[PDB]
Design a protein around this ligand. Structure first.
Ligand SMILES: *[C@@H]1O[C@H](CO[C@@H]2O[C@@H](C)[C@@H](O)[C@@H](O)[C@@H]2O)[C@@H](O[C@@H]2O[C@H](CO)[C@@H](O[C@@H]3O[C@H](CO)[C@@H](O)[C@H](O)[C@@H]3O)[C@H](O)[C@H]2NC(C)=O)[C@H](O)[C@H]1NC(C)=O
Ligand SMILES: *[C@@H]1O[C@H](CO[C@@H]2O[C@@H](C)[C@@H](O)[C@@H](O)[C@@H]2O)[C@@H](O[C@@H]2O[C@H](CO)[C@@H](O[C@@H]3O[C@H](CO)[C@@H](O)[C@H](O)[C@@H]3O)[C@H](O)[C@H]2NC(C)=O)[C@H](O)[C@H]1NC(C)=O
Ligand SMILES: *[C@@H]1O[C@H](CO[C@@H]2O[C@@H](C)[C@@H](O)[C@@H](O)[C@@H]2O)[C@@H](O[C@@H]2O[C@H](CO)[C@@H](O)[C@H](O)[C@H]2NC(C)=O)[C@H](O)[C@H]1NC(C)=O
Ligand code: A1IKD
Ligand SMILES: *[C@@H]1O[C@H](CO[C@@H]2O[C@@H](C)[C@@H](O)[C@@H](O)[C@@H]2O)[C@@H](O)[C@H](O)[C@H]1NC(C)=O
Ligand code: NAG
Ligand code: NAG
Length: 526
């Protein structure tokens, strides 16, 4: 099973899925390793090789810091890298249906992890299911994260910023030059990602050099207009400089500072990334996408507002309890190991955590718009309130505002609201249907009867997997056979969305409307 690419011969491996076969190429290089004098640079192209690459195991994950807050806990460790960390990490994976397809729609997966963490080799990013069940080709790439991939000295090509985004873009390139040899159709490519991956996807909608690299886009719990997604040029400098002071690399020739950080061990760089911002939150994106003038040609809010994006269809959505995950990473009174009923003092104490550099009055207005209870006796009030505040501010309202503005330029948009809690979900019940726990359903993991999921979950995964592929294949995320509910387009007048649950899939209007007026209109004034 050897495939010839533009750079040389690659050999994959044969997997048995659901009494059928998927062919997997794991860990194909897509760029010169960003090492030595190549650290912090845009990813250079790849020289031809005269052999057969063995793409038969996942490559190295990119250098990154690891969630060590909950050691031994599957709920947090299922997200930490599962391969060697190295700077030599610019690789990608291809799953093709067997027998080899002819002109298959390609799905390209971009992982999240706050632009600091993440790897494609994760179990819940395994694309052999979608290859098997829907007959699509699934690609996912590793891209640089944290300072190694997003450190920004605006202007200087030695550290121009947005390198991790250019990694991704060189991967879409590779698919464009090479996927046709795997049976894929480069004119039918749907990007999809989650969290920072979904923010990443929304940025390729804006970046003119990605316009011709994909057809459509699916955004899961993330968009570039979310408060954590874009770092300013102000902060990107102060963060770059503080990394330099922290490593003794402070020079005056801006170029010499980068040469200094290049002769430092990858670890010394990882530990100092924590402290470059004087007060962090659980959602601190220390080194993220900046307005660089190469990938991103302008402030993305202005680009979005004025219609300067790829005109195509989008699939956009969010989970019911986006924000709860972050409450146990700092919010006082919370724990994954009790029900975290917090008092009013504790709730206020938690806004200082999540809105650190916000004025007194701004913290006071969050408390105001979230503590007019219908029943003031309910002791979960402040615990649920703080969750929604974090989820509404960081995820739900930016995603709805992205869909409104994008749909305003005449393109079909589809919004979902994922409200099912995995029966296998390892976090406690008070945290709900958390950030990132739709991915297993999107990737069709509940389709494995062995994995101890319930039958209603196999059916829901089955419906979602069909809806995603139909949207990828046909720009229309319907499930047309098993009597499903029809998913209406999100028009900015009526703002209709589809709920995704194991029971009654329903059509509803104007998600979190009262909350999002606060976050999208009022709160940005403070
Ligand atoms: C890339 O892969 C090929 C093929 O092997 C395949 O992939 C591997 C990752 C494994 O899962 C294999 O089971 C699978 O078939 C590698 O080719 C192998 O190279 C070795 C090392 O030289 C060969 O050994 C020689 O064989 C004979 C004895 O049979 C003598 O002439 C020599 O003394 C010598 O021992 C071997 O035959 C060959 N094939 C197999 C099936 O093992 C290839 O090296 C690999 N490249 C890598 C990993 O860089
Ligand atoms: C839910 O659990 C949280 C988290 O506490 C941690 O996890 C628990 C499951 C236990 O294993 C705890 O031992 C562990 O720390 C509890 O938050 C903690 O509450 C205690 C008691 O209210 C706080 O202790 C106080 O701390 C301050 C400042 O240091 C002083 O006034 C006192 O000396 C006193 O000891 C503690 O700050 C707080 N811990 C953290 C890490 O936030 C929570 O009370 C508990 N609640 C419910 C309702 O289940
Ligand atoms: C811009 O950056 C400076 C420098 O940050 C400090 O040094 C870094 C290496 C790192 O360890 C940071 O945590 C440090 O804060 C910031 O100046 C600091 O400000 C805090 C409070 O904001 C103060 O307690 C520190 O003493 C200051 N340190 C120094 C060396 O001046 C600064 O806040 C950043 N702010 C702005 C507005 O640009
Ligand atoms: C996107 N997959 C990975 C969903 C799985 N869970 C998480 C957890 C975290 C996390 C880890 C450790 N401490 C706090 C949060 C993040 C994350 C990390 C850093 C910055 C962020 C900024 C915005 C949003 C998320 C993060 N992301 N996802
Ligand atoms: C593959 O198909 C090409 C046309 O692709 C079509 O248009 C794009 C926009 C997608 O929506 C896709 O689903 C459609 O099929 C042909 O021009 C091309 O020659 C074909 N090549 C092979 C080898 O099949
Ligand atoms: C910084 O140093 C590099 C390396 O010698 C040199 O090319 C560059 O011109 C220097 N710039 C300034 C402004 O000193
Ligand atoms: C439709 O129902 C049949 C009956 O078992 C099942 O095999 C198939 O996977 C279902 N398809 C979808 C898209 O739900």
């Amino acid at each position: 099973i050897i495939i010839a690419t533009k750079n040389g011969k690659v050999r994959g491996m044969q997997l048995t899925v659901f009494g059928g076969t998927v062919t997997a190429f794991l860990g194909i290089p897509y760029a010169q390793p960003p090492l030595g004098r190549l650290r912090f640079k845009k990813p250079q192209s790849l020289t031809k090789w005269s052999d057969i690459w063995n793409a038969t195991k996942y490559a190295n994950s990119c250098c990154q810091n690891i969630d060590q807050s909950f050691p031994g806990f599957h709920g947090s460790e299922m997200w930490n890298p599962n391969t060697d960390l190295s700077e030599d990490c610019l690789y990608l994976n291809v799953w093709i249906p067997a027998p080899k397809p002819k002109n298959a729609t390609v799905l390209i997966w971009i992982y999240g992890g706050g632009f600091q963490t993440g790897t494609s080799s994760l179990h819940v990013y395994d694309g052999k299911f979608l290859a098997r069940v829907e007959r699509v080709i699934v690609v996912s790439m590793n891209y640089r994260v944290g300072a190694l991939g997003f450190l920004a000295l605006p202007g200087n090509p030695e550290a121009p910023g947005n390198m991790g985004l250019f990694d991704q873009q060189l991967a879409l390139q590779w698919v464009q030059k090479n996927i046709a040899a795997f049976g894929g159709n480069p004119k039918s490519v749907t990007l999809f990602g989650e969290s920072a991956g979904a923010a990443s996807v929304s940025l390729h909608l804006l970046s003119p050099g990605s316009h011709s690299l994909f057809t459509r886009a699916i955004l899961q719990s993330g968009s570039f207009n979310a408060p954590w997604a874009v770092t300013s040029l102000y902060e990107a400098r102060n963060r770059t400089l503080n990394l330099a002071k922290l490593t003794g690399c402070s020079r005056e020739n801006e170029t010499e500072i980068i040469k200094c950080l290049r002769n430092k061990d990858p670890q010394e760089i990882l530990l100092n990334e924590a402290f470059v911002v004087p007060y962090g939150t659980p959602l601190s994106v220390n080194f993220g996408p900046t307005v660089d003038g190469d990938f991103l040609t302008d402030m993305p809010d202005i680009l979005l507002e004025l219609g300067q994006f790829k005109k195509t269809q989008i699939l956009v959505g969010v989970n019911k309890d986006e924000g709860t995950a972050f409450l146990v990473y700092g919010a006082p009174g919370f724990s994954k190991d009790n029900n975290s009923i917090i008092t009013r003092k504790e709730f206020q104490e938690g806004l200082k955590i999540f809105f650190p550099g916000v004025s007194e009055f701004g913290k006071e207005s969050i408390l105001f718009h979230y503590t007019d209870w219908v029943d003031d006796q309910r002791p979960e009030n402040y615990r649920e309130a703080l969750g929604d505040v974090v989820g509404d501010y960081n995820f739900i309202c930016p995603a709805l505002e992205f869909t409104k503005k994008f749909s305003e330029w005449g393109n079909n948009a589809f919004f979902y609201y994922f409200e099912h809690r995995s029966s296998k979900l390892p976090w406690p019940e008070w945290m709900g249907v958390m950030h990132g726990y739709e991915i297993e359903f999107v990737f069709g993991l509940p389709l494995e009867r062995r994995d101890q999921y319930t039958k209603a979950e196999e059916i829901l995964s089955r419906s979602i997997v069909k809806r995603w592929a139909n949207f990828a294949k046909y720009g229309n995320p319907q499930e047309t056979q098993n009597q499903s509910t029809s998913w209406p387009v999100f028009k900015s007048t009526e703002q209709k969305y589809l709920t995704l649950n194991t029971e009654s899939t329903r059509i509803m209007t104007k998600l979190r409307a009262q909350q999002c007026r606060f976050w999208t209109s009022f709160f940005p004034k403070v």
